[PDB]
Every structure is written in structure tokens, then in C-alpha cells.
Ligand binder design. Structure first.
Ligand SMILES: Nc1ncnc2c1ncn2[C@@H]1O[C@H](COP(=O)(O)OP(=O)(O)O)[C@@H](O)[C@H]1O
Ligand SMILES: [Mg+2]
Length: 433
């Protein structure tokens, strides 16, 4: 009940960079929405995840918002839903105001959304507010917090241990642990469970369902990938941060491998640490971090994947949206080089949305003129593209009634990097998803 005016203006992009936990999502977003409704500004609110969309729903109770997730001149949807609708024939309104929460998110749909939105603003067609404690390029891993944090550099294990890490388990509070990969998290979770700890595991595939268990069940550790690192409210006392992640890298323009683990950005480290120190009544939450940060993330496939999406979004005849200016030097590409014709673009969209294929892999298949249900390409690659299950070639019973080795024409290590990913890709290859 302490509303502040936002004298909003078209032709302007505002970066709202209040520190983690300052109340961007819970306090400032509702103020902006009130001003938007009053002034009849057609507005979209963009959430990075269904979890943040749920936290926005709570904060926006009483305000007329159309939720396009799970009279009303404000719409709310996920970053990925916005970008997917921009690729499709579907009528996406020409919003007067774009509000992007967690505007640092580096998933390709989020990078593409920022490029589209910043281009609309540069063209003088709209206003935008990018809400993030860690705008692109930030070199500050230790921003302000609601409560003092104890920051300690330690050796953080990335494997099961039988000695040398007593501080991990001799701790009676709640810990969020950022691991380099789903498989490393599996191994750490099993070590913690053997030591008598109650562990919840989060990844992109499982976040939207498993996060609810953090609100509803008792737990000692959340073992999570980077999906959890922003806009997640955990009731935690300690973060353990590997400060490292596997990175998908395009090798020789022909395949995607998972490289590293490699250091995270200062933005990622700040958001991970920012999960604690959020309660002003609870000083001395701990952030225990396992190494340094780096801004050398140009090898990450997500920058080129963002160009693949942007090249396929219509703005105006002959105009392709640029990446948001501070991100524009992340990728060597020719503007438009990934533009697909109408039917190939529909296949591209369906492979990402219904197929759950990575952007790069969906683009290879769609650009080859393959239709969505034609899975021959899953079996006709070179022998070095053979996918392995328990150190033996993975086998699929195909729609054509043959037992065939999984051997895709284009290899993207993201489809087979963990048991759940491979299970899903095997079903996809069988025409059974
Ligand atoms: N369910 C809740 N009830 C009360 N306080 C909450 C709840 N969820 C989050 N908070 C607190 O509200 C504050 C603002 O959080 P939030 O708006 O999510 O911050 P930001 O978006 O700037 O990171 C933080 O101190 C956070 O701990
Ligand atoms: Mg927030």
C-alpha cells in the first residue's frame, strides 16, 4: 500500500537492476501493472519459468491479467511461449509495453525475446522494462542482499566423497547446491542420501513439478542445475556453488558436444548466491563457492540458437531483429542466414515445442526439408554419431518394425547427456513421444 508512479514512455528501454531480493517481482511489478491498466497500455509480462509465473500471479491478485501459462489488457506468459508464438502464424499483439522479468536468462528463447523487444523499442514502437539484478556484462558476483552473507571460497566436490568435506554434512540448516550437470547432481544426491540427508533434485525438465516439493516436503538439500539460480525463493540458509557448468558447444559447425565443466558468468554466480541472504531477520546465511567466474561464454551454443530463432521472427519486410546491444557481440553470424521458408519454419517450431529438441538440432532437421514425423534421420548418421546406453549402443524398435542402433544424422549431446534426456530421445526416435 505504498504505490510509486512509473512515468512510463514509449521509445524507452529501462533496466530495473535492484539487487537480488529487493522486490522487483513482488513489489515493483504490481506498481507497473497498476499504471499500465490505468493508462490502457497493452502490456505483456514475461516470466522465465512457470514457477516465476506462479509467484507473479500471487503478487498480481486483484489486477486484471490474462494468464497464458499452465478488460484484461495485460497478458502474462513465459519467455519461451512469447518467442514460440512469434515464430508461428498466431496473432501476437503489438504490445505498447514489454515487461521482462529475469531479463538476464540466457536460454535461447529469452535472448531472442530481448532482441525482438529491444528492436521494437529502437524502432520507436514500444517501451520495455528489463528487470534483473544482473544485466548482461555484469562483473559483480557479490551484489547487495537484504541480510549480510558469509562468502567463503572452498573446494566443492563434483563426485561422491568418503572424506575431506565434513563441512557439507556437519550442517543442520537447509542447503541449495548448484551442480555442473544432471549426472553430477545424481552422484552427489546419492552420496548425501547415504549420509542420511533428504535431497530434492531440480533440472529444466523437472523444475516446473519438482520445485513444488521444496514448498510442501521437509528437505536438507536441493541439488539443482542453473535453472533454479534466479527468481526461485527457497527457504534456505546456505548455498553451495560449484561455479561451473557443462556448456553445449558447436564443433566444426556440424555437431554439439557438452564441454567443460567451465566457469559460470558473474551474473550466474550473483543469482546463485542471491538465493540466500533474502530474509532481513536472518543474517549470516552462507555462500560457499568452488572457484572463479568468467565472461568468455561465446562458445555457448545458445547465442547462435538465439539468431536461429530471431531470423524466423517477422518484424517488418526485410527487417531482422538484432540481439539486444550488450549481447550483440556474442556471436559471429550473418543476419538472416537461418531464415526458413513457411513450411520448414512450421517444422522447426514443432520439433522444438512438441519434439522438445534443442534449437540447433531442430534447425538442422527443418532446414534439411524433413517433416516432423519422419524419424529416418535418427538412424542414418555416421557410426561416430552412435548414442551409448550403459557403455553399449542404444537400440530402438522403429515405426518401420526394425531394431536399429540410435545413430542420428546430426549429433547434439543434449539429447543423450542424462538418463531422462536419452529416454525422451529414444521415444522420439521410435515415433512414440
Ligand atoms: N511467499 C513470500 N512471503 C513473504 N515474503 C516472501 C515470499 N516470497 C518471497 N519473499 C521475500 O520477498 C522479498 C522480495 O522478493 P522478490 O520480489 O522475489 O525479489 P526480487 O524479484 O527483487 O529478486 C524477498 O525478501 C523474498 O525473500
Ligand atoms: Mg524476481
Amino acid at each position: 500500500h505504498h504505490h510509486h508512479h512509473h512515468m512510463l514512455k514509449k521509445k524507452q528501454l529501462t533496466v530495473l537492476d535492484l539487487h537480488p531480493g529487493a522486490g522487483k517481482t513482488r513489489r515493483v511489478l504490481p506498481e507497473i501493472v497498476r499504471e499500465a491498466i490505468k493508462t490502457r497500455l497493452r502490456t505483456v509480462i514475461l516470466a522465465p519459468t512457470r514457477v516465476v509465473a506462479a509467484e507473479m500471479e500471487e503478487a498480481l491478485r486483484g489486477l486484471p491479467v490474462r494468464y497464458m501459462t499452465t478488460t484484461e489488457i495485460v497478458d502474462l506468459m513465459c519467455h519461451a511461449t512469447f518467442t514460440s508464438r512469434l515464430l508461428q502464424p498466431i496473432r501476437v499483439p503489438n504490445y505498447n509495453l514489454y515487461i521482462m522479468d529475469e531479463a538476464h536468462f540466457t536460454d535461447p528463447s529469452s535472448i531472442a525475446a530481448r532482441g525482438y523487444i529491444s528492436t521494437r523499442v529502437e524502432m520507436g514502437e514500444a517501451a520495455a522494462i528489463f528487470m534483473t539484478a544482473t544485466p548482461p556484462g555484469t562483473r559483480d558476483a557479490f551484489p547487495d542482499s537484504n541480510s549480510p552473507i558469509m562468502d567463503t571460497e572452498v573446494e566443492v566436490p563434483e563426485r561422491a566423497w568418503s572424506s575431506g568435506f565434513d563441512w557439507v554434512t556437519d550442517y543442520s540448516g537447509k542447503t541449495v547446491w548448484f551442480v555442473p550437470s544432471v549426472r553430477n547432481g545424481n552422484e552427489i544426491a546419492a552420496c548425501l542420501t547415504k549420509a542420511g540427508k533428504r535431497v530434492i533434485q531440480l533440472s529444466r525438465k523437472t523444475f516446473e513439478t519438482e520445485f513444488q516439493k521444496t514448498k510442501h516436503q521437509e528437505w536438507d538439500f536441493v541439488v539443482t542445475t542453473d535453472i533454479s539460480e534466479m527468481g526461485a525463493n527457497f527457504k534456505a540458509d546456505r548455498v553451495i556453488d560449484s561455479r561451473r557448468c557443462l556448456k553445449p558447444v558447436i564443433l566444426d559447425g556440424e555437431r554439439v558436444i557438452l564441454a567443460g565443466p567451465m566457469p559460470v558468468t558473474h551474473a550466474s554466480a550473483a543469482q546463485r548466491r542471491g538465493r540466500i541472504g533474502r530474509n532481513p531477520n536472518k543474517p549470516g546465511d552462507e555462500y560457499l563457492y568452488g572457484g572463479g567466474c568468467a565472461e568468455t561464454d561465446e562458445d555457448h551454443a545458445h547465442w547462435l540458437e538465439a539468431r536461429m530463432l530471431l531470423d524466423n521472427i517477422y518484424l517488418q519486410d526485410g527487417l531482422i531483429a538484432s540481439l539486444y546491444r550488450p549481447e550483440a557481440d556474442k556471436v559471429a553470424a550473418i543476419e538472416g542466414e537461418f531464415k526458413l521458408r513457411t513450411e520448414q519454419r512450421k517444422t522447426f517450431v514443432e520439433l522444438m515445442k512438441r519434439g522438445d529438441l534443442p534449437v540447433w538440432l531442430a534447425y538442422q532437421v527443418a532446414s534439411a526439408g524433413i517433416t516432423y514425423t519422419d524419424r529416418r534421420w535418427c538412424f542414418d548418421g555416421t557410426t561416430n554419431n552412435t548414442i551409448m546406453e550403459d557403455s553399449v549402443p542404444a537400440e530402438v524398435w522403429t515405426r518401420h518394425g526394425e531394431k536399429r542402433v540410435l545413430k542420428p544424422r546430426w549429433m547434439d549431446a543434449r539429447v543423450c547427456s542424462d538418463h531422462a534426456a536419452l529416454k525422451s530421445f529414444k521415444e522420439f526416435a521410435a515415433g512414440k513421444r
